[PDB]
Amino acid sequence: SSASFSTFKCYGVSPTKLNDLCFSGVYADYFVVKGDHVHQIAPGQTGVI
Amino acid sequence: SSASFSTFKCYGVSPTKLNDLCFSGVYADYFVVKGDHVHQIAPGQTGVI
Numbered sequence: 198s199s200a201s202f203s204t205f206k207c208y209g210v211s212p213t214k215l216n217d218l219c220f221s222g223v224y225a226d227y228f229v230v231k232g233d234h235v236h237q238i239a240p241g242q243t244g245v246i
Numbered sequence: 247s248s249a250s251f252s253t254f255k256c257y258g259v260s261p262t263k264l265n266d267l268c269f270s271g272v273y274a275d276y277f278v279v280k281g282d283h284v285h286q287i288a289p290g291q292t293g294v295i
């Protein structure tokens with residue numbers, strides 16, 4: 198596809214193990230920000246967003 | 247030089263001790279990727295590269 202991810206980061210699970218796991222529930226939240234506000238989307242951060 | 251490094255990150259080594267160390271063997275791998283693929287060159291990652 199044409200996604201071309203620049204940032205991909207996970208907590209509580211390691212990326213090399215996702216192919217061997219089963220989940221009981223998954224949710225997906227989606228929105229649009231600007232480039233300087235991307236680092237703000239993380240647990241334990243501060244700022245306007 | 248004209249390298250102008252943008253990513254310099256080391257594992258199993260502190261940058262401030264590189265001048266006081268002696269090594270039994272050193273290998274160097276080199277190649278070309280694109281800008282959004284640079285973060286994939288690290289242990290324990292996923293992606294196409």
Ligand SMILES: CCCCC/C=C\C/C=C\CCCCCCCC(=O)O
Nearest residue numbers: 233234235236237242243244245246
């Ligand atoms: C002149 C400073 C005097 C006060 C210093 C001490 C307290 C305040 C410290 C930090 C202020 C951070 C600014 C807001 C940053 C938001 C996050 C971001 O934008 O990503």
